Amino acid sequence: LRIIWGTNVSIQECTTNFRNFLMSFKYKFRKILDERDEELYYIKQLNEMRELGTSNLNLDARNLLAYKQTEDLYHQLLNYPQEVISIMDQTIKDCMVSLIVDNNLDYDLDEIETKFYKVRPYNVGSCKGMRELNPNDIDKLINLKGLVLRSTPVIPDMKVAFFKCNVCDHTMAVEIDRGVIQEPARCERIDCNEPNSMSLIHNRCSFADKQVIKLQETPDFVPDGQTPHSISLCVYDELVDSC
Amino acid sequence: MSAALPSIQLPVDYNNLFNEITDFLVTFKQDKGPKYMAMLQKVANRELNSVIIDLDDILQYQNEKFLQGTQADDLVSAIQQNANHFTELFCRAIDNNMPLPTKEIDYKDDVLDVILNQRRLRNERMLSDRTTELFPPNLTRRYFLYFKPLSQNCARRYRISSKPLSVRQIKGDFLGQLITVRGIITRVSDVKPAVEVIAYTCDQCGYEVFQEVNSRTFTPLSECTSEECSQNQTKGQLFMSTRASKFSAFQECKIQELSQQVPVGHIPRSLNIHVNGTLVRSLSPGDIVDVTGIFLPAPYTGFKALKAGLLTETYLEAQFVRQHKKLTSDVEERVMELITSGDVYNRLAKSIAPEIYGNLDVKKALLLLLVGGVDKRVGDGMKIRGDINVCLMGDPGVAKSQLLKAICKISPRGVYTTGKGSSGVGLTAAVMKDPVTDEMILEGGALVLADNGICCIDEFDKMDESDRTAIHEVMEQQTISISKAGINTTLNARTSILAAANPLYGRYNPRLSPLDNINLPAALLSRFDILFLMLDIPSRDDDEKLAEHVTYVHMHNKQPDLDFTPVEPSKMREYIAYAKTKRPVMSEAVNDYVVQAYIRLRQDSKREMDSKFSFGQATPRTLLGIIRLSQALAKLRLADMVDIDDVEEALRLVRVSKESLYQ
Amino acid sequence: VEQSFKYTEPTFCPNPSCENRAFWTLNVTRSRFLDWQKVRIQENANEIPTGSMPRTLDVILRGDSVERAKPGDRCKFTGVEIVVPDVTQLGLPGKTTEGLNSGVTGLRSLGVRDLTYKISFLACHVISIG
DNA sequence: GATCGATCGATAAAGTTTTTTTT
DNA sequence: ATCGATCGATC
Numbered sequence A: 001l002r003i004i005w006g007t008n009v010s011i012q013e014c015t016t017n018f019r020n021f022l023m024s025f026k027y028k029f030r031k032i033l034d035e036r037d038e039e040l041y042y043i044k045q046l047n048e049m050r051e052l053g054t055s056n057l058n059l060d061a062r063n064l065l066a067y068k069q070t071e072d073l074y075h076q077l078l079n080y081p082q083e084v085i086s087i088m089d090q091t092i093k094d095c096m097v098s099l100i101v102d103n104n105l106d107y108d109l110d111e112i113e114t115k116f117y118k119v120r121p122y123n124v125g126s127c128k129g130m131r132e133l134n135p136n137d138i139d140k141l142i143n144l145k146g147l148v149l150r151s152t153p154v155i156p157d158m159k160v161a162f163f164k165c166n167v168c169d170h171t172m173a174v175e176i177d178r179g180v181i182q183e184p185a186r187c188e189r190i191d192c193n194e195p196n197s198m199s200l201i202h203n204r205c206s207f208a209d210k211q212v213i214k215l216q217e218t219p220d221f222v223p224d225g226q227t228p229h230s231i232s233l234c235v236y237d238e239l240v241d242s243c
Numbered sequence B: 001m002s003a004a005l006p007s008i009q010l011p012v013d014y015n016n017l018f019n020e021i022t023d024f025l026v027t028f029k030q031d032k033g034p035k036y037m038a039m040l041q042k043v044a045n046r047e048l049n050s051v052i053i054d055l056d057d058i059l060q061y062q063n064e065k066f067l068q069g070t071q072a073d074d075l076v077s078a079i080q081q082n083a084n085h086f087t088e089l090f091c092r093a094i095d096n097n098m099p100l101p102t103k104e105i106d107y108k109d110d111v112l113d114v115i116l117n118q119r120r121l122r123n124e125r126m127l128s129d130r131t132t133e134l135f136p137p138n139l140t141r142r143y144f145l146y147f148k149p150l151s152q153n154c155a156r157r158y159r160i161s162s163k164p165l166s167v168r169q170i171k172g173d174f175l176g177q178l179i180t181v182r183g184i185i186t187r188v189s190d191v192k193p194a195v196e197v198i199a200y201t202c203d204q205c206g207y208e209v210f211q212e213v214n215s216r217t218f219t220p221l222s223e224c225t226s227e228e229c230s231q232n233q234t235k236g237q238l239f240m241s242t243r244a245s246k247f248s249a250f251q252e253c254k255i256q257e258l259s260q261q262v263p264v265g266h267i268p269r270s271l272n273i274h275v276n277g278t279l280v281r282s283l284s285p286g287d288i289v290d291v292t293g294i295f296l297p298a299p300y301t302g303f304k305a306l307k308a309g310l311l312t313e314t315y316l317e318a319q320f321v322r323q324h325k326k327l328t329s330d331v332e333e334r335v336m337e338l339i340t341s342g343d344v345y346n347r348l349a350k351s352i353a354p355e356i357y358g359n360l361d362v363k364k365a366l367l368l369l370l371v372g373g374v375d376k377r378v379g380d381g382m383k384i385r386g387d388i389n390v391c392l393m394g395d396p397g398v399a400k401s402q403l404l405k406a407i408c409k410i411s412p413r414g415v416y417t418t419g420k421g422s423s424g425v426g427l428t429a430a431v432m433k434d435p436v437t438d439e440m441i442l443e444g445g446a447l448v449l450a451d452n453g454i455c456c457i458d459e460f461d462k463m464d465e466s467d468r469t470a471i472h473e474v475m476e477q478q479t480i481s482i483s484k485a486g487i488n489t490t491l492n493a494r495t496s497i498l499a500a501a502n503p504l505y506g507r508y509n510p511r512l513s514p515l516d517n518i519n520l521p522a523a524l525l526s527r528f529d530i531l532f533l534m535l536d537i538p539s540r541d542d543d544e545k546l547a548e549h550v551t552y553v554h555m556h557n558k559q560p561d562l563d564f565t566p567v568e569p570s571k572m573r574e575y576i577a578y579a580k581t582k583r584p585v586m587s588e589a590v591n592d593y594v595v596q597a598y599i600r601l602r603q604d605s606k607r608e609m610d611s612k613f614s615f616g617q618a619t620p621r622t623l624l625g626i627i628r629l630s631q632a633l634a635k636l637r638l639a640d641m642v643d644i645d646d647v648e649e650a651l652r653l654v655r656v657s658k659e660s661l662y663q
Numbered sequence C: 001v002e003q004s005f006k007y008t009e010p011t012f013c014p015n016p017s018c019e020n021r022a023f024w025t026l027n028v029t030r031s032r033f034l035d036w037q038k039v040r041i042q043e044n045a046n047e048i049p050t051g052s053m054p055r056t057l058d059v060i061l062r063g064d065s066v067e068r069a070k071p072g073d074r075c076k077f078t079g080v081e082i083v084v085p086d087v088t089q090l091g092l093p094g095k096t097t098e099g100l101n102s103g104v105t106g107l108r109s110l111g112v113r114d115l116t117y118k119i120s121f122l123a124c125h126v127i128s129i130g
Numbered sequence D: 001g002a003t004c005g006a007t008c009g010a011t012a013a014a015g016t017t018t019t020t021t022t023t
Numbered sequence E: 001a002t003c004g005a006t007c008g009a010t011c
Helices: A013-023 A041-052 A071-077 A083-100 B015-022 B035-044 B056-063 B075-081 B088-097 B113-127 B332-341 B347-351 B364-371 B401-408 B464-470 B521-525 B540-554 B569-579 B594-600 B620-636 B644-655
Strands: A056-059 A118-121 A147-151 A213-216 A230-232 B178-186 B253-256 B271-274 B288-296 B315-321 B390-393 B414-416 B454-456 B496-501 C037-040 C058-061 C080-084 C118-122
Touching: A013 A041, A013 A071, A013 A083, A041 A056, A041 A083, A071 A083, A083 A118, B015 B075, B015 B088, B056 B075, B178 B315, B332 B569, B347 B364, B347 B569, B364 B390, B364 B496, B364 B569, B364 B620, B401 B414, B401 B454, B401 B496, B569 B620, B594 B620, B594 B644, B620 B644
Parallel strands: A056 A118, B271 B315, B390 B496, B414 B454, B454 B496, C058 C118
Antiparallel strands: A147 A213, A213 A230, B178 B253, B178 B288, B253 B271, B288 B315, C037 C058, C080 C118
């Protein structure tokens, strides 16, 4: 398996380890919540993703703790929580395709296989507010309980750039993918195009949404002297102005 | 350079102290061999990150170095002659006697475990990958140091550093030293990650560059500086990475003075404090505490020419905090004393507030409100009222706040207010100005923080344009809210009210009509339940005893009177909590008799119909109060005897409620 | 031609080999103008869920459409969108972490700064039903 | 003609008790 | 006082 300078995560075993766990489930968790279920919620819901065409799978994600294997995947979610959702967005596209390869009459194998679906691991773990957030908590999942206060409208974000200098027609479109925009110091598109006025046409390249919300926690059994403090929020997906 | 750069011939170096730190290997076996090395084992296995290098392990280290006739310089001098040079040479002395692999951690059970070895091994392999930069010593620490002074009889043995000075006299030679100061902690900030190491990534060579952290502003470096990804025609463009650098804790607080060591003149003076290591999240606003720590001034690095020529604006850096004055859980030997002796109705009445004249009946009317009494777990959509509110009136010359609010200053969750300051808009929460940090926070008064407790108020004719509506809004059920332009959210309301409305000019004329000094009749008619009064009649026999009640307190400096064995307030505080774990359920014999007790309460109020003295006109809103306080007195007197004998104690207290004006 | 959102300096392609980008002189004679105004809008009453600080934005009217927009009425608009930054120029020297996307937007070919981008709106034609 | 080095110029600041009519 | 831009000199 591969090895990253940053993480120690594996190759696509855990994707396949999820995919057999996903498909061959039909019931689990009967023992941790022992009371005494013929088919999994997700099994019907994974069929339900295509027939509405949505992009969101609200994963409970307390299923890896119920499963015998995939604990290593489970205890890598809470320790490198950016690559693991970046892995699983590729798999859910293929695991959807794993249903289209059975029935080839499912939306012609092209158009719903362009818009990238995504997932949402929610209600995982437990947390207790703000007076426990140590500096060691750098890349982890946190479960806040509080109250939002006030919102600003959406400002845009540099997801793609554009350039055009002063020649006849040269309409390149560089990417950013960082906090760094890279530029050329000499022209192109012709032989005799020396270092010249490369200009930045700004109102042409597209942008996504982004929104910051301010939160202040509820006084949840606060010790009657401490002022309830505040922390901010940030969002990227299609959840702007739904809260 | 020239011009006095050669310093003086100082007889005090650090190399003469440095070898006298190298001797701090295993030689002090008294305090299971070297006990500071024993504490060194309980940190490497990662369960606590605070060592304590105190002074008793230095003076006894010198006490048993008294007999060896060799030159041993003083240690407690230099660690308070200049304290800040005694954290860094310890760290270059700990590592020579630091047993690393004493623990067993494979993959999990340690934060950041595999990556720190990965960040070590990727530089360990690149120490010999030429067929090079060593670690700065601040990188692989995962630990801190602390200190602890002394003010015991060891200082009275022989030869200060820990005298509890005040901030009024700390102006002089106390820079770069170690001084403990007491005070009152105010303006607590939050916890923010500070930076101690750095790692920029070039994404070409992978040599994460390291640097030390200076004061609160710094600057990144270039990209053509490294040893592999520099020096060629292509250079790895630098950018940062979070997780390749550790981050510490940080919190700021301000001190004030004790309001008794201050002289007759000027106002008290503030000071700045910081925290490091793991003493964080251990202070509170209102802590009557003291900190022990080392001293350091810091530069300003802004607008340096036209202001701040040589000024200092210093702070102090903390080392140790010594905080003070903080259900069958091994105090039951004192909780059984109420269960063995009993004596609920009178000994507990004489227990709370024994400093008054008479009035044992009215001190019983408050203590059942101190245990409250839950109405009903209703389940369905019937949010019924609980937590009745008793109000007082009358004009004595005793300044009766000591007769009410002394209970409020020992009762649990009982906050006090006055007329000025927190108005009715200032009773609930609001949005106000703040410092340069996150403004428009939800500051409040009492009822947004005294939920399910005691709200003891005075001065009912003060700031009434906002007060008089909002006090109804807790008796009006569940509408404590902030309906400003900011938001329209609503929080809860579960707190009892004790009110003492002061009367109007002169004595309240009893021949005159009531509601001549009370403001709102609508609160009194059904939104309250019972009243009391504090009339004065000139009496020959009682007042000379009352004269002896007040003249006797100036001979001694106490009030030894009234032949009662005084009880600590924590006892019934547990018994209120012990009653809170009971919640008795009513029987059926009670409502067979109280139904006509309301009828006995019906025609007598309908007999008078006069505007001369009395109030009340036979409503069930008066009736449901005596149903509420009956189970309340059954809660403090739990034998599960909810019967007629329990409810006759209730009508015992309501017959003295009315006709308090008939004298 | 075509002065952009900050291009107060036409300094490209002189006729002879004179000192290019040395100066300018905004002639009030031949450079034709047009007239505009900048107003704020607000959301209609029959769509607010609660009193939840009803947000807004700003428009620009360009042609003859000036003064047709009587303030304080229900109104419709054309619909072209735009984004406009303005932080660095010749004259005046150019809470929370608003403009956090701006740190990505640094390092253009001129001086390193923190250029933002705020959403705005342009119109072309107005109508006022009611 | 291009690149590098040196010199010169420009860039960073902060508010909230008395007094008027008015309801 | 520090950083950036412009001008001059040298290769």
